[PDB]
Ligand binder design. Structure first.
Ligand SMILES: *[C@@H]1O[C@H](CO)[C@@H](O)[C@H](O)[C@H]1NC(C)=O
Length: 161
């Protein structure tokens, strides 16, 4: 295994996740107290220090932990649920799985608890029926940002073509 995250998969995962839903709704704003992605998890790249290992770790670990969230929690669909494109969701999850498997070496090093703490807060919101839809929408918002930011600020860390 060459342990690399393929940029084309990351870009396509971002596009599918973008296209399957809508903007984060105003009524979900209070959940930002609980679901606040630690943007400081990404390193500040400098000349000769792209910090690709840490940047790829943030992407891989966020996708791995989100995979567990999808496995362990039902998405509500009715009123009080989310209105997502289920076919594009399945396609996103297939790309997510490919990225998590190919980057397994990035999870072989224990990281700071900063990401696990974020996902523990997401889980708590998802596992109460009255807050679940907002939790799903906040998670999607943050995963979109993780993928967008990695491509915008850490493009060189992915393998292309
Ligand atoms: C989790 O939510 C609590 C509030 O319920 C907040 O104080 C804490 O900072 C959150 N954890 C993270 C990692 O953001």
């Amino acid at each position: 295994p060459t342990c690399q995250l393929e940029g084309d998969l990351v870009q396509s995962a971002h596009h599918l996740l973008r296209d399957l839903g809508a903007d984060f709704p105003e009524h979900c704003l209070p959940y930002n107290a609980q679901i606040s992605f630690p943007s400081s998890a990404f390193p500040a790249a400098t000349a000769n220090h792209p910090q690709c290992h840490k940047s790829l770790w943030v992407v891989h670990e966020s996708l791995r932990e989100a995979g567990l969230v999808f496995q362990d929690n039902d998405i509500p669909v009715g009123e009080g649920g989310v209105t997502w494109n289920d076919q594009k969701l399945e396609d996103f999850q297939n790309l997510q799985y490919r990225l998590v498997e190919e980057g397994s070496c990035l999870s072989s090093v224990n990281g700071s608890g900063v990401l696990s703490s974020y996902f523990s807060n997401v889980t708590a919101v998802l596992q109460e029926q009255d807050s679940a839809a907002c939790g799903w929408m906040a998670l999607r918002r943050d995963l979109l940002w993780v993928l967008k930011s990695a491509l915008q600020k850490h493009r060189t860390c992915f393998t292309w073509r």
